[PDB]
Design a protein around this ligand. Structure first.
Ligand SMILES: C=CC(C)(C)OC[C@H]1O[C@H](O[C@@H]2C3=C([C@H](C)COC(C)=O)C[C@H](O)[C@]3(C)/C=C3/[C@@H](COC)CC[C@H]3[C@@H](C)[C@H]2O)[C@H](O)[C@@H](OC(C)=O)[C@@H]1O
Ligand SMILES: C=CC(C)(C)OC[C@H]1O[C@H](O[C@@H]2C3=C([C@H](C)COC(C)=O)C[C@H](O)[C@]3(C)/C=C3/[C@@H](COC)CC[C@H]3[C@@H](C)[C@H]2O)[C@H](O)[C@@H](OC(C)=O)[C@@H]1O
Ligand SMILES: NCCCNCCS
Ligand SMILES: NCCCNCCS
Lengths: 5, 231, 231, 5
């Protein structure tokens, strides 16, 4: 999955 | 409510202890109690609220993904996997509704300064995005549009009031770019947003103090990681 | 009770899904529901019960250790750290009492075969040992002796009925050795037990099938790790 | 801490 913050 | 009899300072102190102990459910409950005292959160307090709920919902989303994958394999060429996936899904939805309720009852209307306003609107887009990940009914389009509208309002303010290296501005762009890619089926918009965000921040790193932007440096690496994954 | 309306097979199936999803609180609740159906657990089912509670109490013990350490620094040369350490401690105690209650009401009296009997008595010693780690009152000595008596009964049976390479026999020796070192202030007994256990199992590895004892191999490495830490 | 299983 792509990274989020 | 549940934390009604505890002093606000004690709830904040206990939220910090729960963070050190990795007890994110307790940390979220203490921070909800602190928000419910009715005073505006400080910058450090806003971070505690966000970390606590991001960790709680993070665990539920990881579990939902595992269950959803097992369920998808069971329907290829009993009721238990579906029942358990629905149980996890309802718990996840309950946590997102709790966060969205705190944002819309306390935090958003009182936030006047750009930093807090963008922070809470980013959270609103994040929790609507988590609800969109599990939405399967006639409500999915409205949930997705609620996430988009929150992210878009936050983007409009951050571009006007914050420098391009501000970690909240960068983090919002990182997450709105992921929303475009994963939720709105707009990979070109996701890529354009991550690229412009990274490029604009790179050109502004000349104005910053050396050890003052470790968070922005980490977010810039995450934009680059996504751009590498997508291109 | 809470899981009273669900079929036993469905509870076992859901315990396995919860394990894959890393939802150990759900896994423990499903396994407690299955034990409460009144049928004897199978070997695979006993492992599910143990893993679920070991992970739940593991997290609480890690948190208690962090809080206890902060509390120790605050009393060197407010009430919040103590209050929160006591909250975590009471939750941990509640989980140990739940496991000990299941062991003493269902599982131990019905276990006739050596493998299950030693498994449940090892669990009884483990959960009394976790209660001893936080015990500070006039009850501490009795709790420690309850852990010792459970481990000792399990040791007596395992030496008579199981080969020295049996993973349950090895795991019991690993944990009873840690009890001697950390709880009973008997480092010489802890070292002697780990050394004899490792040596006896090494001499019996000649009788085993190549890929059939990965669990015993892992436990033997843990005995060696403790012996290195202590000597 | 020492290892247990
Ligand atoms: C519980 C909070 C603790 C652990 C005390 O702080 C978390 C972190 O809190 C701050 O960092 C924030 C922050 C994060 C940084 C990227 C962490 O940076 C490093 C270097 O670890 C991730 C966190 O989840 C947090 C609080 C969240 C956000 C996110 C919130 O959306 C609503 C938007 C971007 C980002 C902002 C607010 C960051 O500034 C600080 O700037 C960080 O310290 C440094 C040196 O960068 C600290 O690690
Ligand atoms: C949820 C359980 C799952 C993940 C399905 O199984 C856990 C594990 O279950 C079994 O292993 C047990 C077992 C463990 C093994 C050491 C794991 O081995 C490897 C190679 O990972 C640790 C577990 O906590 C468990 C169930 C517990 C005990 C412990 C219980 O005390 C009351 C005594 C020693 C040990 C015994 C029962 C082990 O046999 C199996 O032998 C393991 O498989 C292999 C190939 O060794 C499997 O990983
Ligand atoms: N370890 C203290 C972290 C402070 N983060 C900045 C709050 S705005
Ligand atoms: N993955 C299945 C694990 C089986 N372990 C042996 C049960 S006694």
């Amino acid at each position: 999955f792509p990274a989020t913050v | 409510g549940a934390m009604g009899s505890m002093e606000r300072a004690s709830l904040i102190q206990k939220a910090k202890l729960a963070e050190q102990a990795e007890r994110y459910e307790d940390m979220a409950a203490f921070m909800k109690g602190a928000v419910e005292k009715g005073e505006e959160l400080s910058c450090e307090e806003r971070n505690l609220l966000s970390v606590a709920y991001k960790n709680v919902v993070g665990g539920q989303r990881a579990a939902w993904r595992v269950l959803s994958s097992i369920e998808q394999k069971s329907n290829e060429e009993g009721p238990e996997v579906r029942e358990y996936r629905e149980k996890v899904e309802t718990e996840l939805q309950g946590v997102c509704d709790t966060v969205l309720g705190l944002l819309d009852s306390h935090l958003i209307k009182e936030a006047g300064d750009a930093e807090s306003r963008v922070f809470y609107l980013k959270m609103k887009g994040d929790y609507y995005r988590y609800l969109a990940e599990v939405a399967t009914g006639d409500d999915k389009k409205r949930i997705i549009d609620s996430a988009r509208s929150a992210y878009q309002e936050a983007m409009d303010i951050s571009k006007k009031e914050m420098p391009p290296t501000n970690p909240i501005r960068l983090g919002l762009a990182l997450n709105f770019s992921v929303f475009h890619y994963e939720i709105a089926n707009s990979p070109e918009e996701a890529i354009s947003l991550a690229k412009t965000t990274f490029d604009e921040a790179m050109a502004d790193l000349h104005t910053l103090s050396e050890d003052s932007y470790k968070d922005s440096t980490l977010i810039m690496q995450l934009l680059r990681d996504n751009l590498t994954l997508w291109t």
